[PDB]
Nucleic acid binder design. Sequence first.
DNA 1: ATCAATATCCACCTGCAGATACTACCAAAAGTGTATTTGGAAACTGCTCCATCAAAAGGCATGTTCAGCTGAATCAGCTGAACATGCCTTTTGATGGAGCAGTTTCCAAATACACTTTTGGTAGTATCTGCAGGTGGATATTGAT
DNA 2: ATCAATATCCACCTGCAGATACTACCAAAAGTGTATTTGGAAACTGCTCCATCAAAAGGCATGTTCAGCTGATTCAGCTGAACATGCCTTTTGATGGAGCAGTTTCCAAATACACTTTTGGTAGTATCTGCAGGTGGATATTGAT
Lengths: 106, 106, 87, 82, 97, 97, 95, 95
Amino acid sequence: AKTRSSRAGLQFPVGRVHRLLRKGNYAERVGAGAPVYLAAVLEYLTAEILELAGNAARDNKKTRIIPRHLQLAVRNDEELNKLLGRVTIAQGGVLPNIQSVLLPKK
Amino acid sequence: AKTRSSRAGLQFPVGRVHRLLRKGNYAERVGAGAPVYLAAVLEYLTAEILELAGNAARDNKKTRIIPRHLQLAVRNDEELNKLLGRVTIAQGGVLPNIQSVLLPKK
Amino acid sequence: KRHRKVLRDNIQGITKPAIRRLARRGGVKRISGLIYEETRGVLKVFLENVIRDAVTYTEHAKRKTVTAMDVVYALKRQGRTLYGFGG
Amino acid sequence: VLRDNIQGITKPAIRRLARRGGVKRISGLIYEETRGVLKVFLENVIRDAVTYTEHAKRKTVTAMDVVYALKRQGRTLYGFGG
Amino acid sequence: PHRYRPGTVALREIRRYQKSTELLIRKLPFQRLVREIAQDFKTDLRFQSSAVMALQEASEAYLVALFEDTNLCAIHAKRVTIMPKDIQLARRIRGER
Amino acid sequence: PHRYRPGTVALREIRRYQKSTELLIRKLPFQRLVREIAQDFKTDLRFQSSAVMALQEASEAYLVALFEDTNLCAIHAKRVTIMPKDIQLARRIRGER
Amino acid sequence: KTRKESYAIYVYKVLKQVHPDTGISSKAMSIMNSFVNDVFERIAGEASRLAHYNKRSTITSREIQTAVRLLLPGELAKHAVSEGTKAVTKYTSAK
Amino acid sequence: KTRKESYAIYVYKVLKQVHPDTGISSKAMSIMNSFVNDVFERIAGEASRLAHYNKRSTITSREIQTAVRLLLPGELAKHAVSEGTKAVTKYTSAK
DNA sequence: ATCAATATCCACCTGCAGATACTACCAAAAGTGTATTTGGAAACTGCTCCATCAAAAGGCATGTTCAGCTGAATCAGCTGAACATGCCTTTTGATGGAGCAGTTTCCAAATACACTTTTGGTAGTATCTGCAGGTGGATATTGAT
DNA sequence: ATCAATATCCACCTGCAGATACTACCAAAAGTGTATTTGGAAACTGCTCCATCAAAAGGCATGTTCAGCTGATTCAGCTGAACATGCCTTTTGATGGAGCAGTTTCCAAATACACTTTTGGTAGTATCTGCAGGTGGATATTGAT
Ligand SMILES: [Mn+2]
Ligand SMILES: [Mn+2]
Ligand SMILES: [Mn+2]
Ligand SMILES: [Mn+2]
Ligand SMILES: [Mn+2]
Ligand SMILES: [Mn+2]
Ligand SMILES: [Mn+2]
Ligand SMILES: [Mn+2]
Ligand SMILES: [Mn+2]
Ligand SMILES: [Mn+2]
Ligand SMILES: [Mn+2]
């Protein structure tokens, strides 16, 4: 007895995702290949962000990922930024950016 | 045999609305009231726009409602405008509005 | 229950330095005298819209308690989706 | 006399559009900026419509494909079905 | 010989195009561009005639509305002439940039 | 006695606040405001403390973002001081008004 | 061939109740049919999420009502709520 | 004392693969969970609509894929689609 | 360019909250294995409606001229930043209790067929009319003197 | 001011593209009636976490001073608006044929359904660790001169 996750060689819970597609009322029938593709996309996406957030945490000499590191990860990456263009990350703050004309002298 | 539209006192089709709720995957089950209620709400708003679009036709010396009249109806009404805030009405055009500072110095 | 204090003019608890601090995070260098009243004005519209929807979910669920979920869904409705609170 | 397709979106055409938006005076550089903005508008919408077309296994983009593309771009259109 | 002053016809025009609802881009040049952009996404496409109509209506609605915001930004800088930095500002604030 | 010139401490504060992620409004005052407003929709409500926090995180993210847009409108007007006409313009373009 | 359902006839019915001498052109009707579809989906959409959030299997008139209150602005909500409460009554109190 | 599912253990597994020596705070994990639920809901929604638009009563790997292409920008779509195909293929041959 | 105040940097150093570690239990997942129905892919094709193009049509590309708009420059006035000063209001940690939410019980309400009547959509054919353009002439607006 | 050029308003006229009236039709809703299942209100109550209060801890309110920003003023030069029209692109309408959509067919994969095994969540309890917040002290930074 192998989990459907391992049959597809995934960490993300295929069984679980299959279940939530049914309980979520998305269509009359859910195909057996739909939660497999979905569990994959979900895993790809979270690896993408965790890779980036990890780097931010290293660039700050920290060992633990905090919400600030997710914020930096998402906002410094053109595509995550857009995917989450309308999302607020609690306790992420903002990117350092000061407009040119606000700086002193010339 | 008496229709549910007639029972409710409505022009809008309770039967159809009912069917669209089940076949639309909104919930496992749909109560007997909900299609009556929704049908009434839809008829209501149809009437509100038509009321106003009729008036706009009269103002312009015309008997047939065209899209211009629906446009004028909606964007001249604070509330319909908000509900349709992110909607485009094909063949609507815009409200006559010129910024005062653009007007010739009298 | 005996007595419950009357809540009035709490918008002024949003102080001048707090607003200035938010301006700073938003990259702002100089602030006109009248920003503070405008900002309070704007904050109140924002909160009224989110609280109205959240309170609506609360009443719908038949609760006297506004939950984090009530707020998170209110936010989602208005296109201001918030991560990190169960939602 | 050859000519780029985007340039078929002419100055007097852009001028009318601005005019309906209530604009009195227009800098000469606006015409190229407008064409750029239109190109980006259309790319995003057609990208999605086409995606809908392919899914349906058709070779014709339908009014509905476009209507649905517009809906998901937050730019809902009334008058063409659905 | 007769000559209307600058802006006089501009105003006359604003008034005319705000009264009416017709599409203000010529259909064929618009259609070609639609086809050219689509060709990058999928080859040998055909187009329902109303499909192009829809795109035209939406594009013109979009551009007319952006010209309104643009114009507001122009007037915020105490000008009456719209400029690319105004379009830039409007889009940036709309979250398109 | 030593004096920093107008603008200097301000840039020091920009860098300071843009670097941190803590909430900038005092908790209690913000909570009372939430209750006063909620109360006016419906008497006898209670709040999970994380409800109040969720509202605080959303509000502060909204205002910081609005101030940025507001900052851009002022600079477009060739000023460096943000004014109510700037906040109004940013809110109009965003379609909140 | 294949049947194409529209709200046109019921839109026309309501027009006559309200402006009995006023006509509507096609494009106008087409927009009105979009409008009726748009609002159905938004009201049914929100009702749908309401039930889910509350761990419920059923969309009832209570869900439609709250949905209406979330979606419609102030004065539009009030009249809509009452119009729909009136119809549920009229439908109940009738053999 | 009802059970509340999260994606935490799954998120943490994946964290270990990419940065073996980095931990995640629970607030950051809360944000990740919100993120997984968010994206799930958005893809399923696109899929849901998609199927309805084409008169289909079944959501298959083929609807999920279009939804992914509709939802994600450019370079993430390209990769998500690969990762998706690969898993379904590997799954198809593995029973 | 040099000096003196005060912010800033960073690498090192204990308290400790929150993170990570097991141990056991377990209810609900998740799986496995038949029995049974069907969605929609496949394949064939009718007939709209789409791309192409000819002739008919009507908008735009063109270069010149100069009105008035923009951007540069100057500057008086006063608004807003910095800072010192005096002290109120928030933050924090501890506690009875209100209402959330966990479990159980049961009927009003929903589903599920099946069978009967109806209606809304289509389509043929005919008939009908509101109003876009057209004309004609008065009157109002704009610009020249 | 008055005056002439030209746009704009309005009244009336009329062909025709698109609204409307009518009949025939049928498949597909829609409704009615009979047999069954269940979702969720209600009624009880464990037990988390909300409102509430007291003491501790730190940011806010205020006034004074003046640096430098904003808004007002002037002005020259550069830039777009206005300008007539026949070349050439677009519009129109007519016609083959590509492909959308209608129908039929049949099976790979869908649902259902029953017992079997696995597991993710939590609960009671225990030790470990990353870093916040403190410290001093060597390296900028700013603004007076
Ligand atoms: Mn009150
Ligand atoms: Mn079948
Ligand atoms: Mn109690
Ligand atoms: Mn009939
Ligand atoms: Mn006319
Ligand atoms: Mn039950
Ligand atoms: Mn004092
Ligand atoms: Mn000059
Ligand atoms: Mn063929
Ligand atoms: Mn386990
Ligand atoms: Mn530190």
